[PDB]
Write an enzyme that holds these catalytic residues in place. Structure first.
Site, short mmCIF file in Angstrom:
data_model
loop_
_atom_site.label_atom_id
_atom_site.label_comp_id
_atom_site.label_asym_id
_atom_site.label_seq_id
_atom_site.Cartn_x
_atom_site.Cartn_y
_atom_site.Cartn_z
N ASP A 164 8.19 24.74 -31.11
CA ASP A 164 6.95 24.21 -31.69
C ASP A 164 5.77 25.07 -31.26
O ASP A 164 4.73 24.60 -30.78
CB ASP A 164 6.75 22.73 -31.36
CG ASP A 164 5.78 22.01 -32.29
OD1 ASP A 164 5.43 22.57 -33.37
OD2 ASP A 164 5.36 20.91 -31.93
N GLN A 219 -0.19 10.43 -26.44
CA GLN A 219 -0.52 9.85 -25.15
C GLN A 219 -0.47 10.89 -24.03
O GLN A 219 0.38 10.84 -23.12
CB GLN A 219 0.36 8.63 -24.90
CG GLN A 219 0.06 7.49 -25.88
CD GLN A 219 -1.27 6.90 -25.59
OE1 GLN A 219 -1.50 6.42 -24.49
NE2 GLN A 219 -2.19 6.96 -26.56
N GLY A 236 -6.81 11.93 -29.05
CA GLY A 236 -5.50 11.51 -29.53
C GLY A 236 -4.68 12.54 -30.28
O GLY A 236 -3.56 12.23 -30.68
N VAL A 283 -6.89 12.66 -23.72
CA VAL A 283 -7.40 13.98 -24.15
C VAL A 283 -7.44 14.13 -25.64
O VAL A 283 -6.74 13.45 -26.39
CB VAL A 283 -6.57 15.17 -23.61
CG1 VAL A 283 -6.37 15.13 -22.13
CG2 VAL A 283 -5.23 15.32 -24.33
N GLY A 284 -8.21 15.14 -26.05
CA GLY A 284 -8.30 15.62 -27.42
C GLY A 284 -8.37 14.57 -28.49
O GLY A 284 -7.85 14.79 -29.59
C1 LIG Z 1 -7.52 20.08 -22.49
C2 LIG Z 1 -6.20 19.83 -23.23
C3 LIG Z 1 -6.09 20.81 -24.40
O1 LIG Z 1 -6.27 18.52 -23.81
C4 LIG Z 1 -4.99 19.91 -22.28
C5 LIG Z 1 -5.13 20.49 -21.03
N1 LIG Z 1 -4.09 20.75 -20.22
C6 LIG Z 1 -2.86 20.46 -20.62
N2 LIG Z 1 -1.79 20.81 -19.86
C7 LIG Z 1 -2.59 19.80 -21.84
N3 LIG Z 1 -1.30 19.52 -22.18
C8 LIG Z 1 -1.06 18.99 -23.38
C9 LIG Z 1 0.35 18.65 -23.68
C10 LIG Z 1 0.76 18.31 -24.96
C11 LIG Z 1 2.08 17.98 -25.18
N4 LIG Z 1 3.01 17.96 -24.21
C12 LIG Z 1 2.58 18.30 -23.03
F1 LIG Z 1 3.52 18.27 -22.06
C13 LIG Z 1 1.29 18.62 -22.65
C14 LIG Z 1 -2.08 18.70 -24.29
C15 LIG Z 1 -3.37 18.92 -23.95
C16 LIG Z 1 -3.69 19.53 -22.71
#
Ligand SMILES: CC(C)(O)c1cnc(N)c2nc(-c3ccnc(F)c3)ccc12
Ligand SMILES: [Mg+2]
EC number: 2.7.11.1
Length: 302
Positions: A141, A26, A22, A19-20
Site C-alpha cells: 500500500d 483510529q 480521521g 490524527v489527520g
Molecule cells: C502526523 C501523522 C501523519 O498523522 C502521523 C505521524 N506519525 C505516524 N507514525 C503516523 N502513522 C500513521 C499510521 C497509519 C497507518 N498505520 C500505521 F501503523 C500508522 C498515520 C499517521 C501518522
C-alpha cells in the site's frame, strides 16, 4: 505472538488526539507518560477474525521497522475488556510530526513538488523498500499518504496492515489488495482472474505512481470513480508525466518504475542506479527547504 502477555498502557502511554481528522482511521497522537516522547498509536479491536492480519502487522513492526526509512515500532499494549467484550490493541510507533507526502503536496503552491524534492523522497522510499524486499516483505500500500516526514525531514514508511511476508525472493501472492489508483496492473488482475499472481515488483509500480502524485498533485485517473480506474489501469498505456517541462532524467525514471509487465519491471537495486535517484548534489539544501516548509506550516496553523 502472545496478546495475553501484553501490558496495559496506563502510566506508560496516553492518547492525546485523533490524527489527520480521521484520514487514517483510529490512529492517534500519543505521548509517553514519563518522558513526554511523542508517538503515533494505532488502536484496533482484537476480534478472532483478524488474528492473522494483526500478527502479520506486529511481526513486521517488530522485525523490520528499525530501518531509518520506516517509522520505528515502540511496542504493543492491550486494554482488556470483560468477557464477551473485545479487547483493544495499541500499536505504538515513532511520531512523524511533519505529516504525509500527500499533506506536503496539498500545502505547496500549485500542488506540485520541485524535482529535487521528488528525487530525495523517492530515494528514501526506495531505500525503505529495498530493506523490506531484502527481507521478503511486500508493503502493498505504497502511496503518498503512507510516506511521512519527521520534523528533521527524514522520510518514513508506515502501515504494514496489508503487507505480505514471502518465503523466497521469487515468492508470489494473489490477494487483491491496496488502494486502486496506486495498484499495479498485476495486482488488479487478481480481482477477476483467480489464476493471476504477483510479486514484490508491485511496490515499485506504486512508487512510480507516488512520484507522479508528487509531480502532478494526484495519481493518474484520480478524477474518476475507483472502479473505473481499476478497469483502465491494465488497458491504458503505462502512465507518463504529462508535461515536457520535467527533466528527461525524471521522465526516464517514471518510464522505468511504470513498466506494465511486471516480469520486465526493475527491482529496487536496479532503480536506485537510475541517474534521477543516484545523482543528488543538492540534497543538503533540499532538506533545509523541506524543514523550512515544515516550520512555516507549523506556524501558519497556530
Ligand atoms: C502526523 C501523522 C501523519 O498523522 C502521523 C505521524 N506519525 C505516524 N507514525 C503516523 N502513522 C500513521 C499510521 C497509519 C497507518 N498505520 C500505521 F501503523 C500508522 C498515520 C499517521 C501518522
Ligand atoms: Mg525506523
Amino acid at each position: 505472538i502472545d496478546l495475553s502477555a501484553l501490558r496495559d498502557p496506563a502510566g506508560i502511554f496516553e492518547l492525546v488526539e485523533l490524527v489527520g481528522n480521521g484520514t487514517y482511521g483510529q490512529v492517534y497522537k500519543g505521548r509517553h507518560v514519563k518522558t513526554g516522547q511523542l508517538a503515533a498509536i494505532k488502536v484496533m479491536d482484537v476480534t478472532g477474525d483478524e488474528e492473522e492480519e494483526i500478527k502479520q502487522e506486529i511481526n513486521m513492526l517488530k522485525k523490520y521497522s528499525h530501518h531509518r526509512n520506516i517509522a520505528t515500532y515502540y511496542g504493543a499494549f492491550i486494554k482488556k475488556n470483560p468477557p464477551g467484550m473485545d479487547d483493544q490493541l495499541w500499536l505504538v510507533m515513532e511520531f512523524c510530526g511533519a505529516g504525509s507526502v500527500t499533506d506536503l503536496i496539498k500545502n505547496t503552491k500549485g500542488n506540485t513538488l520541485k524535482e529535487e524534492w521528488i528525487a530525495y523522497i523517492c530515494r528514501e522510499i526506495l531505500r525503505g523498500l529495498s530493506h523490506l524486499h531484502q527481507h521478503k516483505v511486500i508493503h502493498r500500500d505504497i502511496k503518498g499518504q503512507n510516506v511521512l516526514l519527521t520534523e528533521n525531514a527524514e522520510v518514513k514508511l508506515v502501515d504494514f496492515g496489508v503487507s505480505a511476508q514471502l518465503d523466497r525472493t521469487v515468492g508470489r501472492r494473489n490477494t487483491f489488495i491496496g488502494t486502486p489508483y496506486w495498484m499495479a496492473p498485476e495486482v488488479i488482475a487478481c480481482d477477476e482472474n483467480p489464476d493471476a499472481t504477483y510479486d514484490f515488483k508491485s511496490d515499485l509500480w506504486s512508487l512510480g505512481i507516488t512520484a507522479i502524485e508528487m509531480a502532478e498533485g494526484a495519481p493518474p485517473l484520480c478524477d474518476m470513480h475507483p472502479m473505473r480506474a481499476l478497469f483502465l489501469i491494465p488497458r491504458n498505456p503505462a502512465p507518463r508525466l504529462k508535461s515536457k517541462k520535467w527533466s528527461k532524467k525524471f521522465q526516464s525514471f517514471i518510464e522505468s518504475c511504470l513498466v506494465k509487465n511486471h516480469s520486465q519491471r526493475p527491482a529496487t537495486e536496479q532503480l536506485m542506479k537510475h541517474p534521477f535517484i543516484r545523482d543528488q548534489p543538492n540534497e543538503r539544501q533540499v532538506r533545509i527547504q523541506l524543514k523550512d516548509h515544515i516550520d512555516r506550516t507549523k506556524k501558519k496553523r497556530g
